[model samples]
Target: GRASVGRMIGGIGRFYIQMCTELKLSDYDGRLIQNSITIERMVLSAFDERRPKKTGGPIYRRVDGKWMRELILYDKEEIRRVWRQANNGEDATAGLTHIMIWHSNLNDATYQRTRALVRTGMDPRMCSLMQGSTLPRRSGAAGAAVKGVGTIAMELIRMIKRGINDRNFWRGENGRRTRVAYERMCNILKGKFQTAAQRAMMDQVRESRNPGNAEIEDLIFLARSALILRGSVAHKSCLPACVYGLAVASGHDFEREGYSLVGIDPFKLLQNSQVVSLMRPNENPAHKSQLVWMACHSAAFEDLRVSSFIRGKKVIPRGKLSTRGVQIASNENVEIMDSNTLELRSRYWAIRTRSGGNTNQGQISVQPTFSVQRNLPFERATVMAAFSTSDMRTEVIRMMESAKPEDLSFQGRGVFELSDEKATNPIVPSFDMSNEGSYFF
Candidate 1:
């Protein structure tokens, strides 16, 4: 009996060591090996780039399941820290920007996989995975004790099947967008993040004369770039911010009517050589999918088209074009421009069009105008913002009030939605970019 007890203890101890070792090599801290080399060498190295061989370590492709988990956890921690900082009266612009750019690679890859699945249609095995649950919903259920492939991969697979099946099963009888499911996937890739933050930053840029701060400046730059080159899908969603930023940066006031650009066809944008050139070179399909989504469902622009382009030539699109019915054309003659070029052009154009190309500008002081603020409330505020509750509203209020600082820090970062038994169970939040509500404790 004594020997059996000792053996069991040793087995548990080994498991502990294994987990610790895995985290060490895979987590953000562990990635910072040596002077500056990081685990990103494994996760993000391109075919053109080569990393030097190191002594005794897991190679890029050979890392186990724990390594993948570490990457996902790293993102989760970043989101938490950013939200915490925001709630604690700190500017979360830099942190939010970091996550947006950093996670782009992950999101892009996920989109590519979905595109592949769409090509082949769905099968039983694929449907089984899709039927499980959304990625955010499944992530929490898999605790540390259970380990396998990362949730992003699983979620992407599931979403791909769901989207494809929905496309096949649906018929557009009520003038509803038929390919809306696939379009949703595209929106996800183009950063299905909060509009509140984007709008807040733009308002700041508009209110300031000199580059307000790093965040404000960056926002202005991104907005201007989106305006000039007009990268279509990405630019379509970004146009509002770009217009606001250009107004401030070029000594002009914003009027949405000034910019009458409309009737964006996402399918044509997908195949446009100029638009494709602006996309990440590693994968072109991912870029196309995003454009498709923008055309089909993005409320950012009007008169969106549902068309297809094959090799720079317009085909009979799934839906009609603009009211004029002019087929979209490739901008082969138009040189692809980077952000810097677009920024310069936007400034020059703003001056030329708004102020008769005046070289000398009247200085105007800008002030923050938007009423909305970023970040979750750390403690009980006069207003608590969340979706309306059913009978369990009382229980939900209790959970919100009793939650520790750490718990409150990540309130809306995960998947917590409604259930049929909500009348009996406690209510939890499901905050997203589009949701609008207020709360009281």
Candidate 2:
């Protein structure tokens, strides 16, 4: 009798069709777009590439015309232990090196075996070489540098401890070692580093001369970088760039005459806001206030930017009102009431548009057309206004406070211009019952 088949052989065409449907890969003109090696690798990397656990139970094979069940023994704990030992220690070099080598082996071996048996192999080199993944020498150097810095910094702390020991006058071997380490650290700290002056000079030159172009160029780089990290796992790597890009695209310019990107800790800023919110519930509520700051901060902004499907080129607007409009309007006295009215109308338009419209009919459906809109006014007048005025601040404070747990929200990007006006703007537009257009029904 024929050896019992381990698994029943399914129809190839049915399997293919099922896979195609499941993956949402439709047949395009009789052939589907084949997934590239890069995409496959990325998908594998995104999930755990080296996932443990056996696939089949009691795999069967014909050995010398005899029915034999192959025993595939795998030690999951041993594999984990190996990985743990490989990654063990203060430095990441060994771990990174092991990971890189493992990747290399899999790449080469798999490709070679496939090539030998099936005639075709992976194209465009699927394995990561340098970018994102670690390189042995590079990782070693980085690891060494990190370890050296820690050691030196630790030595400095020891030196400080030694300095506190007033009974001994730089005595004993330990004291001498501490003194020497302290002196070296002081030298390293003295005026920063060797290339410090050069870097400073370059920065000064860049800032003073051709600053506009330089800033724009920097902004462009940051935007592209942010876009690159959009769907990437290493999004946290480009934190500052993402925040800067968001701010730039959202019409918030901190580089106006005298402003610095290099400022105090964002955590401290959050802490300060938290303290203030507790004292002034009318001004700032914990939830909304936190969200506002979080959006402005790097981490949360990165999340919102990556998760959303919104796509566009980086466009940093001038201000809420156009520069030209501001100049022209400056010549004439505009009433606060009129400004508030316009603000309300503009906010209404933005909220309506942002809500996104659609139409449906049994026989016919209306296609949506996108028109360019300015978030600048809404941003400055409402979101940005929270930064300055107590009224606007409390408005956001209440909004966040009153929201249900299931309610959805989005974080905003950019810095808002400060305003002292007491005017309030709602997130969603409210219908005025007394108004002419109120009764659309």
Candidate 3:
């Protein structure tokens, strides 16, 4: 209200709020928390740009996730250190930026298998020899050891009839399995993991395929990454975030009302080139599905790019606009003001716009990593913030002759401050083009 930025304009209930401002990476303390993390990660920090932004690391794909891995990695001793730092620090969460996640269950790749193998501490090839309680539910039912035997028996019977095609069945996968497992594994006897020696086949008479072992052992090494895994943070509001991000990033002001859809449509949403590139929400909530499709229209109308993965497959997306000029930064980019001199809390910098979904999604999923206790969703659910990207445009307009900047394209683009021009396109035309590229080149 009083300033040009940092005013809460919109938010659903309390999930999150939004605003637009220019916070350059240079503005923050810029310390890498990863510098202090203790773990052997597989991510190649030097090749960040070349890697797929997938979540399987049991490793990080994005450069920022490497920064974020600070929250996901570490052992009990390390977590205690982290908690102490979080508690002792002046508040590392103030200016933190928003990241998107969909709670939808991916149809492709079964995480349960990954989870099971990690639990068993065995290799994938050896899964055939593993036995009992694949679904474990943390295997704490006083008889998981007993129930495991029966669970294994069921898997054998069903696997025979299902023709061994796929591992299918569902429950609160929006982290349900991980949640249960996180509790069982972390809450007690750290070294006494007796049940992990055995792994995945469901209980009851349902579900044929078991997750099998061997395939999961890496998760054991990865530790919490498997439990919280980026996929687990999906939420419905992200759909709205994706929709709004595109609306703002595209700067759609065509017909006064601008680009908008009044009805819900699925195929037309993805079929049309303009409707592509929007981040998809997980199966947790389908209500925003309409909002997402409409934004897809905006994305395509402006011509950005294609895709938002689902079931481990990429959707055919179309577009050519690049977002290099955009300045919306992230955890590693934005800074907190609380420790004003030392800003630590990552300001919700941007919503991931292009390329992401269950497995291959971008690393914005790191939000929960910091919020989750020990990187486990056990302590609480991740809090998210979603605000009006377009509405802010209106206020911005009212503030000036009107608002915005950049030739930025949001195929699902969600953040607003593009400060990267410093190194890329630093040429600003001015009569006083004296500095030669600092401010006027």
Candidate 4:
């Protein structure tokens, strides 16, 4: 009823909290991955702000001409599978598939309601126009005299624009980079653990500057982006980052405190990044399929750089939007901006609750921080959609914050550097960890 963008972001956030609540796995590392994913998804949710809406529910047909609809409705089935396993009062994940799929089937048309940029009289300034959701047209450039303005570049822009059209779709690029980084980090750590002196274990694939080559930057991008698209694009990043972040953070306990990572997958470089399908509870055991490890050749790191973001200036309060749900905190900070612009002002302004008590005086009350109007599109503003829910079970603290594309491409604005330090040093001291996170005024 309120807005569409918020619902999508919030819904996924709510689900993650619930998953963590059930799994008992919401460590600081998971928190980092959560923010990483939420930020990327929020930014890309409106990559163009005009991509086609992806609605779920019987929106397709079958081979036998039978009415069939699926893929988008994965959340329902996925949740049901979780419930059935959880209700056993035993281990929920004991019998579950390693790769889990989830989609709420709620990707609605309201997201594309650039039409609702109107006022319904209830809130006059609630109009999206007043909010400047529009990205103005690009103006004059040099004539065809421009280099590469010929037939070849023509095909380049068209295909580039066309590939991004399926913004909601997922492929295996995420799964690929995730494994590479995670495995590389793990193997390098193995060297550190065993005191096996190896030369440049992380440089096997050559983190090169070649036009089509991938760097740790690409790995970081995939790790962040995978926090969306639960099964394909999402779960891939989700699991690897948690394990990678956690492994990077806690291995000292392993060598010193009698602890080591238990379920580390065999991630040898040159090994395939298989697209393993996530299955449901009632699935057939005989159905098996396999694919090799390869990043999507069509998509490049630059593609993500333009579509995703980290955040701008960090703020002080770190608005405890809700313990159940947070206000988008990462890098051990929140997404509050430090500017004076209306769009860049305090997120608190958007959380305005002019409701009649917003609760019964006799009943408990809390901050009405759930606002979706914050997601009115902007060409430069690539913040995320925040999510929250009634029960603490669905707690998801998130907020919208913007950062330029160059900022993201520039070593993930130092989040990559922060983690990169740990992977390299293996013994990250406080001086550097806090240093990478800090920026000068």
lDDT of 2 at 104: 33
| Model 3: residue 124 alpha-carbon error in angstroms | 4.6
- Candidate 1 lowest-lDDT run of ten: 347-356
Query: Deviation in angstroms for 207 in model 3?
Result: 18
lDDT of 3 by residue, 1-441 (tens): 112111111111011101111111111111111110111121112112333232211111124322222123223333233323422332212111111111111101011243444434433432222222332222223222222221233333333324324434223573445335433432222221212211221111122223333212222222322211111111111122222222333453222432212111112112221211111122111212322332222221111112121111122221211111111123433222111111111111122222212221101233453544465322111122123222322222232221122222223323222343112332221122122121000
Q: Count the backbone clashes (under 3 Å) in each candidate.
A: 2, 0, 38, 15
* lDDT for each residue of candidate 4 in 167-236, tens digit (9 for 90 to 100): 4222368644544543443332222211111113223323332212123222222222212210111111
TM-score of each: 0.18, 0.18, 0.19, 0.18
Residue 13 lDDT, candidate 2, scale 0-100: 19
Error of 2 at 184 (Å): 3.3
Tell how far residue 146 is off in model 2, in angstroms.
Answer: 6.2
Candidate 1 lDDT tens digits, 1-441: 323322222222232223234444332222111101122222122111223322222221114322121122223333233233322444323222212222232222122233333443322122112211222232222111111112222333444345345654334552135334333332332232123333333343333322223432233232332221111222111111112222233343222212212112112111221211122223233333333333222211211111111112222221222111011113321122111011111000000011001110011123456677754334342124234312223232333344342222223222111221122332233232332211100
Candidate 4, residue 27: the lDDT equals 45
Clashes of 4: 15
Minimal lDDT window, size 10, model 4: 101-110
How much is the lDDT of residue 230 in candidate 1?
18
91: Cα error in model 4, Å: 12
Q: Which stretches of candidate 4 lie over 4 Å from their true place?
A: 1-82, 86-111, 119-441
